[PDB]
Design an enzyme around this catalytic site. Structure first.
Site, PDB file in Angstrom:
ATOM      1  N   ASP A 113       0.841  -1.187   0.000  1.00  0.00           N
ATOM      2  CA  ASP A 113       0.000   0.000   0.000  1.00  0.00           C
ATOM      3  C   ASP A 113       0.882   1.245   0.000  1.00  0.00           C
ATOM      4  O   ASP A 113       2.021   1.214  -0.487  1.00  0.00           O
ATOM      5  CB  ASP A 113      -0.976  -0.077   1.190  1.00  0.00           C
TER       6      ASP A 113
ATOM      7  N   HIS B  10      -4.115   5.981   3.412  1.00  0.00           N
ATOM      8  CA  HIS B  10      -4.815   4.740   3.109  1.00  0.00           C
ATOM      9  C   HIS B  10      -4.083   3.533   3.682  1.00  0.00           C
ATOM     10  O   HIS B  10      -4.705   2.657   4.292  1.00  0.00           O
ATOM     11  CB  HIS B  10      -4.983   4.608   1.600  1.00  0.00           C
TER      12      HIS B  10
ATOM     13  N   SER C 240     -11.624  -1.630  -0.646  1.00  0.00           N
ATOM     14  CA  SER C 240     -10.314  -1.695  -0.009  1.00  0.00           C
ATOM     15  C   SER C 240     -10.425  -1.662   1.504  1.00  0.00           C
ATOM     16  O   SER C 240      -9.457  -2.008   2.191  1.00  0.00           O
ATOM     17  CB  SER C 240      -9.431  -0.547  -0.493  1.00  0.00           C
TER      18      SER C 240
END
Ligand code: NA
Ligand code: NA
Lengths: 294, 293
Positions: free
Chosen positions: B47, B84, B234
């Site tokens: 990520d 994120h 996600s």
């Protein structure tokens, strides 16, 4: 060498056991309509050969090859002299006929007769390796190909080419099913192989790494000379799973609208089990129970 | 190029829930004692990096590496400038602390921060490939290894090198999880070996989907030691990735053997409930870890 998992012949008969109890117990008839009875599958039976003109099997034979020295080693002569391979074949896919015979788990699936064992149930590592290669690579006349490999055998030690062949099969999307047995450790011990234990019809549990169980005691199926036989042994459970995978593959590829990987076929198999209340070391994921999601 | 699957940032807060509802809904607390909270697992989070001094995450970080041009490409700098990656990490394994903070699905699992996306959520195919191999090859100081790979990203091109990396991971026994998403996010989620996760809300309402998990208003860790509610596939994905740490622990004990990737996948999709949608929409159903009781 490699040998059949031992079993007992309880009875030989001409009396047709229409739909045997094991086929009913696992709820195969409940899936037949949705699964088109297993049509579009070929189960490669690596065993003692098959009576290819048995009335209950003749319409199911897609092909085969002899890897033994029987019949001069003629690769095109793969009849059964022992009976065990014929019995396996009938549990997988004996035809649904109007005449009273038996019926298998996937009666529109076809069979690839991969004769790797002599009349005593024995074969070499070279022979089993050759049979797996052939099961993966064989192609029939109208796109037919093996979709499940079924074994009721084992040998005591590893062999790199045996592992490589099993891995190549699963990497091609083909489940590799083997009966639970130290003398029969391989190929059942490989992580990739689906290893099947047995229960009786009371659901009692009859070195193993079990994935699931199926019926294995007093299992009627086809036998030599156009007859039928009831056999008992841990390995009678395995053909129930191999045939069931033909049904599961058909339904699941339609429902998910995609080709399934071998891991997905395995997952759809173990979703179609019920726990029996024993430890997972004994029953794995439980008893094959094909209609459980309905 | 590869990019994060789009998602929404709903709120940033310093007053988070203790047990986020998604963790509860999938029934992770019901497995914590038996699974030792996921101890003995390392989840590689591929990520945007991670805030590695976040109070909820700092004791969980096993290591990491940077494959992006953030911080001039320094491989040993893998902090998060996006948020994120930090959020994903907290859903997997935010620590169970007496003081406030959130808790993840597997709060004693450790995290490998595999920074393959930059501050904008973008990365190269080569960097994702390198990150997957790094995750496969990583070894900890007492023999720890990656046990799950978790991704929330996609690109339109089928690079055989990326397929091969995914195949290498599953052959090494490692589930590879990716969020579900005209095909601008197709790969690696489209590969047969990848477990692709869709999303539901807390009312059980809603590609090649394998299963679904909560993905709407998911609270987790965020930048600057804060917390945030986000929404998207996600967000469902780390629930599955953390759940696999719990499943691995319980299943390897119960079966008394090391499980293959296919067995881990089967144990995951066994622990589902149907929601009434076609399998093309919900896959095997909603993750429900304690359903077998
Ligand atoms: Na018949
Ligand atoms: Na915390």
């Amino acid at each position: 060498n490699i040998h059949l998992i031992p079993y007992r012949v309880e009875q030989v008969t001409a009396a047709p056991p229409r739909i045997p109890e094991g086929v009913r117990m696992i709820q195969a008839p409940e899936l037949w309509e949705s699964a088109e009875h297993g049509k579009g599958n070929v189960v490669a039976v690596l065993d003692t050969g098959c009576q290819t003109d048995h009335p209950d099997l003749t319409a199911r034979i897609a092909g085969g090859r002899n890897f033994t020295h029987d019949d001069g080693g003629d690769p095109e002569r793969f009849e059964d002299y022992n009976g065990h391979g014929t019995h396996v074949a009938g549990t997988v896919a004996a035809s649904l006929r109007d005449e009273e015979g038996v019926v298998g788990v996937a009666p529109l699936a076809d069979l690839l007769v991969v004769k790797v064992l002599d009349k005593e149930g024995s074969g070499s590592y070279e022979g089993i390796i050759a049979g797996i290669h052939y099961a993966i690579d064989w192609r029939g006349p109208e796109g037919q190909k093996t979709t499940v490999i079924s074994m009721s055998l084992g040998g005591p030690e590893d062999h790199p080419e045996l592992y490589e062949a099993v891995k190549r099969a699963v990497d091609a999307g083909i489940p590799v099913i083997c009966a639970a047995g130290d003398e029969f450790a391989y190929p059942g011990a490989y992580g990739e192989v689906i290893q099947v234990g047995a229960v009786d019809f009371d659901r009692r549990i009859a070195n193993n790494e079990i994935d699931l169980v199926a019926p294995g005691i007093n299992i009627y199926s086809t036998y030599l000379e156009g007859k039928y036989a009831s056999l008992s042994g841990t390995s009678m459970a395995t053909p129930h799973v191999s045939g069931a995978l033909a049904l599961i593959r058909n339904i699941s590829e339609r429902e998910f609208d995609r080709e399934l990987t071998e891991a997905e076929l395995y997952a759809q198999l173990v979703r179609r089990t019920i726990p029996l209340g024993y430890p997972k070391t004994a029953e794995g994921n439980g008893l094959l129970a094909l209609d459980i999601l309905n």
